[PDB]
Amino acid sequence: DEDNKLEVQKVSNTQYHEVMNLEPENTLDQHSFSLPTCRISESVKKLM
Amino acid sequence: FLTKKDLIKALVENIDMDTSLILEYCSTFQLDCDAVLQLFIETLLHNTNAGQGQGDASMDSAKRRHPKLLAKALEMVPLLTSTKDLVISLSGILHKLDPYDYEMIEVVLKVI
């Protein structure tokens, strides 16, 4: 509900321009948290 | 990460390092590549300048290093963007070099 947005609108009021001008070059090994390409049975997808 | 410069000395003292490794290390932590490379060349020549004097057998240990020193020094020169300060410091070191160390003069003048 919107009653918990009292602590949210106080965060979405900051204006920043020094952040979008800097892109960190830090990298991650994101291959360990995705699902590789495969062929699944349509029954499993319909069950999900 | 502003303190990540502290390793720059410790990295340079090692003879065997890749240049692209230094470039990516400087790029990751937002460090100037030209100053690090010129300091790397300065220390590369100073270590062999500081590797001499350990008796009368240091000449044989340095003579094999010198062609490798020049070969590794020549490749990073195109990677810099402003060598004016590097050349000025190299000229100062050359003026501080020994007159009977003609290999140092050969490598220094060729790098210039």
Swiss-Prot record, chain A:
It comes from the Eukaryota. Widely expressed. Transmembrane segments: none annotated. It is found in: Cytoplasm; Endoplasmic reticulum membrane; Chromosome, Centromere, Kinetochore; Cytoplasm, Cytoskeleton, Spindle. Belongs to the ZW10 family. Interacts with NBAS and KNTC1/ROD; the interactions are mutually exclusive and indicative for its association in two different vesicle tethering complexes. Component of the RZZ complex composed of KNTC1/ROD, ZW10 and ZWILCH. Component of the NRZ complex composed of NBAS, ZW10 and RINT1/TIP20L; NRZ associates with SNAREs STX18, USE1L, BNIP1/SEC20L and SEC22B (the assembly has been described as syntaxin 18 complex). Interacts directly with RINT1/TIP20L bound to BNIP1/SEC20L. Interacts with C19orf25 and ZWINT. Interacts with ZFYVE1. Overexpression as well as silencing of ZW10 disrupts the morphology of the ER-Golgi intermediate compartment as well as the Golgi apparatus and slows down ER-Golgi transport. Essential component of the mitotic checkpoint, which prevents cells from prematurely exiting mitosis. Required for the assembly of the dynein-dynactin and MAD1-MAD2 complexes onto kinetochores. Its function related to the spindle assembly machinery is proposed to depend on its association in the mitotic RZZ complex. Involved in regulation of membrane traffic between the Golgi and the endoplasmic reticulum (ER); the function is proposed to depend on its association in the interphase NRZ complex which is believed to play a role in SNARE assembly at the ER. This is Centromere/kinetochore protein zw10 homolog.
Curated annotation (Swiss-Prot), chain B:
It comes from the Eukaryota. It is found in: Cytoplasm; Nucleus; Chromosome, Centromere, Kinetochore; Cytoplasm, Cytoskeleton, Spindle. The chain holds residues 1426 to 1537 of 2209 of the full protein. The gene is KNTC1. This is Kinetochore-associated protein 1. Essential component of the mitotic checkpoint, which prevents cells from prematurely exiting mitosis. Required for the assembly of the dynein-dynactin and MAD1-MAD2 complexes onto kinetochores. Its function related to the spindle assembly machinery is proposed to depend on its association in the mitotic RZZ complex. Interacts with ZW10; the interaction is required for stable association with the kinetochore. Component of the RZZ complex composed of KNTC1/ROD, ZW10 and ZWILCH; in the complex interacts directly with ZWILCH. High expression in testis.
